[model samples]
Target: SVDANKVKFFFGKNCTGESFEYNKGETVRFNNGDKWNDKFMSCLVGSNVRCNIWEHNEIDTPTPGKFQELAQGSTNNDLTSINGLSKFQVLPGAFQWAVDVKIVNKVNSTAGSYEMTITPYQVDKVACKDGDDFVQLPIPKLTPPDSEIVSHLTVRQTHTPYDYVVNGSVYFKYSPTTGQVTVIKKDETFPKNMTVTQDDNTSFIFNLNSEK
Candidate 1:
């Protein structure tokens, strides 16, 4: 007689149910009680393993009870209950998400009565468009000045002579006689040695050489 064939089953990481499964060649780790219920439970040749399995109500049932009462006509529900919330569209070179799926094993049951379920809950992708669909702009430029300018001063000196003038006094005299320019000796005590002083009265005299 021929020996019965050996089989295994697996669930994808994307599955949403709380209960996970371990196949023949895989390891089993339990978290939040979402894994296998019965350690030594029997499996048919074609039994399908659930990737995510959760209980609607805690008081309802455990693993074996749910498995024994598996319904053939249960309504196919949306991914919301499993918290499969997001989705994205696919396009050519424009923008899109790429998805790939693989089946690791067929079944772990000897009776070949199990079937696996795959639920695609969400997808994410970028969009695509034409090159000319966008716009671009150019930058601005600057030029410097040719030249710049800097500092200026002016001076005029005049001397008047009239005989016998009082100190610190100015007088205007008109005569047909003569006009003379004088160089007054400067007192060395002054800041620039440019001012003149004479007598105890301190006076300056305009020296005149008789001219006609």
Candidate 2:
């Protein structure tokens, strides 16, 4: 376990530049005028204590759009090994500001000390794409009922001119005009070709045939 009180972080490599420390359950956010914006590049986690780092996109709120996880019992003197924004795309003619960082102790109820170091670096920019060539469609949200055991719900694109693609959580197979999705239960096997399952006590089986 880590002692949260002893955790420390720096803004330069090899423990140099601006430095900051945190106690258990404490969170730090770097924003305007605080030199430690996207410049944090290194870290050192205290023993037995983990740290969660967040990157904020919106300026008005503290909500994190992306985040990074630094586990306890490890020391990362250089942050470049894990920072994703080290190489990012930049849109032409549009200015994007650097992201803010927020650090918090992983264990809320526990009491301990922690330590870390951080260094800042410059992010890259790239060109942006312009035009209205993309098409958007609204998808219906489906929720399974609590009373019934639904094996799967398959959606078939009947008469659309463009090809349909499946982009949700369920596993699916897509063809030119049909899509077959499967929902699985523990230790149960359902046939891929059949859309309905046979009842245990009844003699009849439900069929899901398409209406012409």
Candidate 3:
């Protein structure tokens, strides 16, 4: 049972031995072909598509710190090439969203599990797709970074011209109620000055001129 949208290139490593999965739809690419080129070594991305894997065959052109490093697998075993994210363009509906995000929990008191969910910003291809399903939406994984979690999301305006850039030190603060990066941001402009840089992780993109 192989559905639409798929990718599984495992020669072994977290995604174990001898594999080659590529679903043909409107999207799928594996450059330098020859049974799938360079043979592969670890990968399994496909919920509705989001993948990037290569080392040669050269499919690079989304630079600035290697940009996602073309994830879809281990990226080793001489991958050669592969890529996708539904091709792109899905953030256009007038954009109106307020903003406030503060994640200073540190996972402090680690056992083996923690939580967080504020989707869109895996590396901005329309900020984590809702038009092509690059995945994740169901807030239930924010286990008390110090205890604070409120959720709601839909504010994508990222191509960057004059506002809307979040790469994460996780500090875009606003508090209607004790903030810990919870989302409601309907341009709910009790506060909106969007632009917080330096992301080792986590991301957001919003700005509709701060709705009145």
Candidate 4:
């Protein structure tokens, strides 16, 4: 019940630059000669289309629930301000999940499209603050019942600034009927270990320092 030709992305501000048309349920990763990663400065979407943006790279392809929703209306400038992230600041990796878009609903048909424009900008050079650096940790894998749905996931950490004694964990729950899973992190401090468990009794635990 979805049409894929309902969305279009532009590489220039105000719908300029090279353009590409995508259908509903289509996902685009900014790699493979497709300079559209953080390069997407603007977009045109069908009235019935909705899109999601992700921070993870395409290599990992995190679940759809992990993505963030993009603005539905026309944009005349950069999208970095929209999500607290800087514009054109590509994450430290190749083949990252730049953007994902899909049809909101197929019940009604429309001919109108939404025009959006996002410009790329450079991050102001600045000195790093004490304890302002962050380290990336691998997310633990969690399995759920086939009928369960995953809504969202979160990570939390607790520790002193610039201190090595970090404590952190990742948590989530699932709803059987809705098939939704919500991931939550309990704190903002650093993390040392992680445990994932479901109300249905499925659980997994991993020690972050075991390899060290």
Candidate 5:
């Protein structure tokens, strides 16, 4: 069971100058307006609730027997293997599956009612160097009758320093079954600008929006 009191809210700006606006009493707006004339909201935009991000190790890969392999490997295996392969097979980082958030509103009437906003959160992650303290687990060859591989990751809560804008609320996420976070290769340039496309490959533009 999940403890209701542990839920918390996180707040992060879209970008340095990005903003979410509301015109009096509209549902909600992003960039500057409510209409979908701009970018989609990302989960990474807001502060993450600081609850422990638990490991998600329930994946398994099923392969067929030699006799069955000969029958299906030519086509079925080719098609299914690619789709069934778990990301943990190749990548080396954290794996978080979900998050739980709790909202505590002193204003009783309007409490526990809010929408979640998320964005593509990008980070700088260099490859694990040789002899680094980071644990290296060898990728084991998958055996027959296996459909997915179960890889385990660590879980913990990290707190960011206090911010005057958000007050002293501790940001956190809580869940009942499982919560997962995965760490992957940091795109050399995680486009910080909403208008910047993947093909541009230019530095982030900060002048597009104003500070809220």
Candidate 6:
């Protein structure tokens, strides 16, 4: 089934409507006037080969994945990801799987913004890390496989108002089901006042106070 060796993209579902096929894994771009740039709905991948697709948001990103399946027709021109033949699979931006934790500098000082680093907790190592949790810092990807516990990352800050050290750790976990966000072990070193803003159940944002 060498026909399967090639990947096909169709404008309609179930392999209908207009389509474009590629062989030998060539790199392609759907430039402004490119015929098949954002016109794919369904894909036919040859069993002998692998393929990927990307969405539009990352069009500004250079060549991009393990590849996640889109909700049938949910990925019109929003798809990207490719292997085997080597190309980008840009998918739409309606889907996400990574949990991002960030720190904002509101130190109220004009000198400089505090420096920060993420410390992974052992509990996060066991319950969350799970060998291949696949985290690229600030963006911990909690995909598939039921998640057990949360992650404890002490937002350690340095180089501030004489650096009194506002060190506090918070724990967070992502639910493989329904996008779960759990905050436990509210231990000291946890921010004096933390916000419940892991909005959308996966992404997180943290703000720093104007003190040591």
Per-candidate RMSD vs. true structure? 50.2, 23.4, 16.7, 19.3, 22.7, 12.0
lDDT of 1 by residue, 48-132 (tens): 2112122221222332211121111122233233322111111121111111111111111231211111121121221211112
- How many residue pairs in model 2 have overlapping backbones? 29
Candidate 4 to truth, TM: 0.32
Q: Write down the lDDT that model 4 would get.
A: 0.32
Ranking by TM-score: 6, 4, 2, 3, 5, 1
The candidate scoring highest on TM-score is 6
TM-score of 1: 0.13
Error of 3 at 91 (Å): 16
- Clash totals for all candidate models: 20, 29, 8, 24, 30, 33
Candidate 5 structure quality by residue, lDDT tens digits, 31-135? 224333222221111122112211112312243211111110011112222222111111111222222112222222432222112222222212221122222
Give the top-scoring candidate (lDDT). Answer: 6
Q: Which stretches of candidate 2 lie above 4 Å from their native place? A: 1-5, 57-65, 81-212
Clashes of 6: 33
Residues 1-212, candidate 4: write the lDDT tens digits: 11333666677776778876665544333433554465666655444445545443222234532234453333334555433211121121221112211111112133111111111112121221112211111112224332221222222222223232223333333333222334344555323332333221111222222211
Residue by residue across 127-186, what tens digits does model 2's lDDT show? 111111111111111222112222232222223332221111211111111111122323
Better lDDT candidate (1, 4): 4
How does each model score on TM-score?
Answer: 0.13, 0.32, 0.25, 0.32, 0.15, 0.40
Residues 1-212 of candidate 3 have per-residue lDDT tens digits of 22225545566555666866564222232344455444454555544444432232211224322123333222333332333211111111111112222222122232112112244323222124222212323222233333333332333332333233222222232222211223333343223433223221112333222311
lDDT (C-alpha, whole model) for all candidates: 0.19, 0.32, 0.31, 0.32, 0.20, 0.40
| Candidate 6 local lDDT, residue 173 | 56
